[PDB]
Ligand binder design. Sequence first.
Ligand SMILES: [Mg+2]
Ligand SMILES: [Zn+2]
Length: 1278
Amino acid sequence: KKEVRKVRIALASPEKIRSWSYGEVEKPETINYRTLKPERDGLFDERIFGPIKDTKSIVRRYRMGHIELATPAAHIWFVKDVPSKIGTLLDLSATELEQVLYFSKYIVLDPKGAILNGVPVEKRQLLTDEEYRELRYGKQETYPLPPGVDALVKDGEEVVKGQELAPGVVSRLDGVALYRFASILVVKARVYPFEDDVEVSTGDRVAPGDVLADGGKVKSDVYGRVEVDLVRNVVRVVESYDIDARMGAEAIQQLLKELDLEALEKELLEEMKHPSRARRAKARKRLEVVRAFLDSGNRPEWMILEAVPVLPPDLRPMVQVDGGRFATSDLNDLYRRLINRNNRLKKLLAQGAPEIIIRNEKRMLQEAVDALLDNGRRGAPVTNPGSDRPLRSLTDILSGKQGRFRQNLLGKRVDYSGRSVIVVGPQLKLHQCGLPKRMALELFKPFLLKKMEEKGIAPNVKAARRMLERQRDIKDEVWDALEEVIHGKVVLLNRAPTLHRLGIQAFQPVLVEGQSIQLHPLVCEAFNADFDGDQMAVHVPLSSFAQAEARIQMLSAHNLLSPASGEPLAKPSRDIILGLYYITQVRKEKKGAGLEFATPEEALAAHERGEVALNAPIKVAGRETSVGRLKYVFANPDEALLAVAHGIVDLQDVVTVRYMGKRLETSPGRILFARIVAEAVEDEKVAWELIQLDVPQEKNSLKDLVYQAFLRLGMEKTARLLDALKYYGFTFSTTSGITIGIDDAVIPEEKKQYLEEADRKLLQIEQAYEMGFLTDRERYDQILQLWTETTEKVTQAVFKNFEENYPFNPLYVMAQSGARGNPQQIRQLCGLRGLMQKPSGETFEVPVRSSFREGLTVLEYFISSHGARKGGADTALRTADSGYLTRKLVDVTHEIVVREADCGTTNYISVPLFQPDEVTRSLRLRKRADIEAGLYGRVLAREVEVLGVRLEEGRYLSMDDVHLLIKAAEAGEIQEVPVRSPLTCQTRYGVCQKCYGYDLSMARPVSIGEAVGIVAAQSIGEPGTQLGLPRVIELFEARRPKAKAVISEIDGVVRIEETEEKLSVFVESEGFSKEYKLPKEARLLVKDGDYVEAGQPLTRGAIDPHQLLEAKGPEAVERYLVEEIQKVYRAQGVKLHDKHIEIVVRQMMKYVEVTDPGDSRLLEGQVLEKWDVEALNERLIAEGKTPVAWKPLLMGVTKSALSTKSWLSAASFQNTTHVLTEAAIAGKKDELIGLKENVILGRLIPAGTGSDFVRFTQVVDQKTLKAIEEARKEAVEA
Ligand SMILES: [Mg+2]
Ligand SMILES: [Zn+2]
């Protein structure tokens, strides 16, 4: 019942394994082919895993078995991890020593080693088993003797080298040769005769000084075993004492049993505090392991495993494919192999012990356990021979690109989904999408079944399915049921590359006849989907709760503004823009008569007579008014438009119309546009005030109109305005007749002489190059400058020509309006595409004189093919590169969610209003877009009054406030604005509403509980696809730029010495001077004698963020990073707000490394807030003034993503093995904070609706409220 908050991962005791499992499996018989039921106690046995029939089969998913190995085993992760957990807990070498002990046959033994073989005492040294059992039993040399011969050697003869033991036998070392009847026994032992009782009997191993026999007469002199022979009444003392011997895991277990963590910890402390850093680094590397083992409970004794758990059968099922053959998970094969090996070991130990065979089968079992735990690390165990496909192990199931972690994180398949090609849906409103009738019928199939079961169409659901199974039985009643089903439902449309949040959009389906999905044209840019045939997909959420989600916050009618900025995305598109520009344009032709009209009053009649003739046009360029203004005057807009309907005057003709209160000299087109705006909305005074009816409706004007309407009216009215505006734009674009012919690409004639002049100039330049006054580089620069100047001159001439001569040219009308094209494209069409770049990256000397209006020569087309190929390849790579960048960003910033009470942050950031450096030393107000992206939607840190207006502290900066601040800065009152920011928020995991701000899909302040981190990452990454990018990569991944710029770290004065070898700049201070050397290519930007501060760039180039943080501090480098990121984004024309960059930069520098240790080690770095809390506890909450002096560490996006307190995300991110091992050494209570973890958990995501702030909210109607409240007051008795 209680909510899961922490997941603790830890190690298992053998008792824990026994309690966990329900019985033991000991046959290698999963299931026989004949008996499809579980055969015997094997891997699928019935009574041990739960019944296979109908508790459910989920016990066979939950209940697990176990194997009680007679021989202990150690987990492969703790022996093969890069830091060998046993190899770092113990003093053992991982690469060979640990494996050779744990698989092969060597000896490890602590207690005693003073026995000498030319080598001093042993404390923890390794000796091979061979010399071990040599030293175990003294010195053995044997030489047989023929029977029936009493040789010259007696039972106690001493023998040295060179002595003839026989006529042909010679020994090898000095010692004693014992005689048997029947051999000679050479030993390096000591014999001792005696004549009294024995104190040490046969078998005992004795130390010097201990009594051997005969009381004090005879005492021991060396270590070794004692053998008493009563035939000669003598003691032989071999040199072999009682010495410990263990093999394999039990030995390790012995080690782990004999190792105590507390004394180990103290001696590690001593071994790290005393010497230099060289040993203490690895001392900490193993001391963290020791502290984790000690502080987390679980002792390392069971860190090697005795009872192996057995996976429930349904997690590894053998399921039939065809013809009796069973497809199996390799886990079953590995378990069968392990069971067979264990049973072989069991019966082997039961029957007899051939020692070499026992060692061999111990190695066999250990390798089998290794393979079971994971395959590939030691050899490549494979399936039955002939199929060289490596078996799949537990690590393979968990880890890998397609594993348990990496397959729930995507969920590549969904049930209620479809896809189709999309077509324009202009007849639909913005909150609708056209759905083909067949996919609409099949998608809601259960809904259809239930709804037509509500009526009498079919008796039951089975009859319904059988009737609908064929389309020959369709009826119009079925279609009525269909339209009944989806009256209120919505579906989610999805584009395959989902670069941002708007790639998923809810819609209301409308039944249509056809194959394709009809899409509203206005969302043609929300999706990056054209109509060249590319497809788009549809999903259908089932639960009414999810329907509420989609209809409320994912419905497209409600998301009209970007999350990346305040700009709208539902702005009128190309066609509507062209139509409305055509309807609200005013022409102008000619005045060949006396234009003076203000003076003469007979000029009204005189020029009316002139207009009767051809003296002056109806739209004449009169001094004060056109004769059209005089001739026609309209009481109402209706009269003007009705007179237009009678063809008297066009929609583009100026005329005096008496509007609601004034006489306006406008065209009926502009009046009609104002009428459309006023009809789409309810009130007209507001509509009249929020439009600009004296200029053509260019795309910027439409965008401003839409934004203002959104601000002042809200959601529904803006949507209706967009619908009506699009509809009228379409109709007037149709009836107006905009068309493109070959003659529309008019060629201005004046440019011709321009070319000649350019040509002439080339000649002198060529002559200037012929005389040798110019070098190749400067000549190329001169030619490039001349051509790029004359191209601009020709473009200016082209636009002047289009203005003067043909106001209504289709190319010119779409250039002026925001429909399509750029001046460069129009110049290519009509003028000349002069400069064409070379494959090397430079530009050809010979330009392209021709245009597409004329014909290109073969060579010119062949040359332009180079640039075509370059652009194609660039796009084809940058697509995937930008996707990968977005992946990095979302991984690092997925923890940021606005859950908050307003944090008491007495801190802020001062957003500049003047560019610190637009020239070398000058201040100018930042570009309006820049100030908007820095200030719009922020919160004022403290009250400011600039122009007689009191902007109180805590007031969100709306668009009007930003404009007012910009105007004030223009006047010159303030230069910086103090604002709250995420960079200074004190919220633990996320930001507060005040520190975050005000920009959203809406304008209102952000709701508490939305993952602003994910949308931040998406807004950063989406423009990257159409974007340079290496700079962005090297900035979010904190790296060392190759073009490093020399900077200062201390304030002082600049002393530039012009040493020709290397320019030496001296930062001079009172007590010290710093010197920097600049090579020939290092072009500085400072002047001698200038005052210089910390972090001031001495040379031109990029700045390493790490050294900048070292010099100035966190805030300075944060501002530098944000500005540098914004630089490239502005350079590409993409408008992006700074909230997202600030969020990622804050997540980038949430790590500090302490320097003065407190209650833990010093040279360790992790989350800053942890020392925030810990310093609060150490200094204030608890006693003990130990300052945990930390330094902020700046690491790239990747490293910050990797090092996380939670281990779920780390396991799902890079490598499950090492991460899980680390999280297993210490019981890691993973808090379910962060979003990726709760995705893996599949539970309610913390962000959005799943925020505990809104997760539960009792709701009750009013009448039941009165009932329950009456029960309440009657519950209060008396
Ligand atoms: Mg396409
Ligand atoms: Zn805050």
